[PDB]
Amino acid sequence: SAAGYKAGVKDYKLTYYTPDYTPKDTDLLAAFRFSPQPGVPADEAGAAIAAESSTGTWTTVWTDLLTDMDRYKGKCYHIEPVAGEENSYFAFIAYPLDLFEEGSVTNILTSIVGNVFGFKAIRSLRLEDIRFPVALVKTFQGPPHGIQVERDLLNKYGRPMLGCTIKPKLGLSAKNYGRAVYECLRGGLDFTKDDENINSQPFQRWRDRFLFVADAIHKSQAETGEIKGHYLNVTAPTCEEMMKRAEFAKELGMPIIMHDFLTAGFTANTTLAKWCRDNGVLLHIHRAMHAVIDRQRNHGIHFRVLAKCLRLSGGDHLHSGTVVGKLEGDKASTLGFVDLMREDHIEADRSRGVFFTQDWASMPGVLPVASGGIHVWHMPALVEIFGDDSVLQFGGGTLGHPWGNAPGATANRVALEACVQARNEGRDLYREGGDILREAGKWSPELAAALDLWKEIKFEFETMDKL
């Protein structure tokens, strides 16, 4: 029965370490990588994590006996040492479906990563993966549109889409912003975008940018006969401002906006994703701040958890990294979470960092966006890695062309189409990529100029975020 109240401190593992537990399909599962403080056994540390992220605290309370603790408690059901590493373990913890607010990524994170990372008895803690049960996945809207509906809306089929961040990051007036946008789009890029930190500032107020950018989109679309877009950044100080900005984009008939989901937050993001669905505006998601959280493998949250959370909260695009560009991205890991954000069913595969099999119950996929420090020479590798359902973005790689934006855009557009054609013909992009590019450079002067400029530029450093 209610088994008597005995006040006092007990070991967590007496209640919360359940090595004989078999997870239900409605359980939310979490994989943590942890190092206990000297003198703290791994099973007690794993139990403490399970306890303080579900139902438990540091001492025994009588109120437990008013309810059915067995039904509600988190259950550390498996611990395994990390092969080859001293004092590092994986704990697998099951959480009942009942613990979570439906449709709330905010609530899920508050439990799983709310307090346990600062526990004295633990040196470091990193959340590697979460299996979201299908019954919980169905309480979320997910992407406002998703990959296939987006291609259909934009009439964009048969290859990766191309984008470009306007530079300098900050400092350009609204009119000069639209100028740079027009010249980029007229040259063959599908999209341009605000920099993540372009919101509304003294040098460029948001409503002016929206106005001038809309003009640039109309002119370039009229000239090229292809659908053009520019991710207008609605990231704002408050929900009210965010919505005010989203609203004007709709008023201008803009097809796509962007949002920094982490610096604005999941609560604002989920609001925006619902609005986008109701108003037929595509939503590009920038992952600003993610590396504060996901870079080091001993502590934090791996990006693949953040990617899963974003697909639930809602986004049509999400930056995925490049692997080859100026910012870090492990290839095996990247292939793993690109599958997690695109596909409907992803089998567990530890070699790609996928700890749990994940089902999405027909929730639309999210387009991966490869951006940052990439140029034309990267094109065959990018097409190889990401395939057709991706957006490849060249900011400096367009505006840094010796002849300017429109030729810079054409260089990238030609390089892409040459690679897609070659791939489709059976050419090996890895072995023949340089040649495919040289070939196209023969008849495209603007591609030739770009190939020359960035021939030497590589970014090859040690990956911190190893599996």
Binding site: Q148, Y157, W403, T410, R413, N424, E425
Partner: protein
């Protein structure tokens, strides 16, 4: 140094490459077939990007095994609709999305 980029209307995928030879067209149709996509031929009197729908030529070639079969329909469509744009598309019925799409004919000037 630098040239000012000219203004020229484009037509989405492959329209920034040199016009495809009929052998380059066949290679793309081979890729379709190999990939399991179903070929579809559509035509339109205009190429307006804002429009979702072109007119379907007959029905999709659902069990198309030969590139030639596709090319023969493209020829048929042209003799009937030479004043129209004609585009070859491949359709993935499992993802239910159009996977390939390129213009194979543009109207008389």
């Amino acid at each position: 140094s630098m040239k000012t980029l000219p203004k020229e209307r484009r037509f989405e995928t492959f329209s920034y490459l040199p016009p495809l030879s009929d052998r380059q067209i066949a290679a793309q149709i081979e890729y379709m077939i190999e990939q399991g996509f179903h070929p579809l031929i559509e035509f339109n009197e205009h190429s307006n990007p804002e429009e979702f729908y072109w007119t379907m030529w007959k029905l999709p070639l659902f069990a198309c095994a030969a590139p030639q079969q596709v090319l023969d329909e493209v020829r048929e469509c042209r003799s009937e609709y030479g004043d129209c744009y004609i585009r070859v598309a491949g359709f993935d019925n499992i993802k239910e999305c159009q996977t390939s799409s390129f213009i194979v004919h543009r109207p008389g000037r």
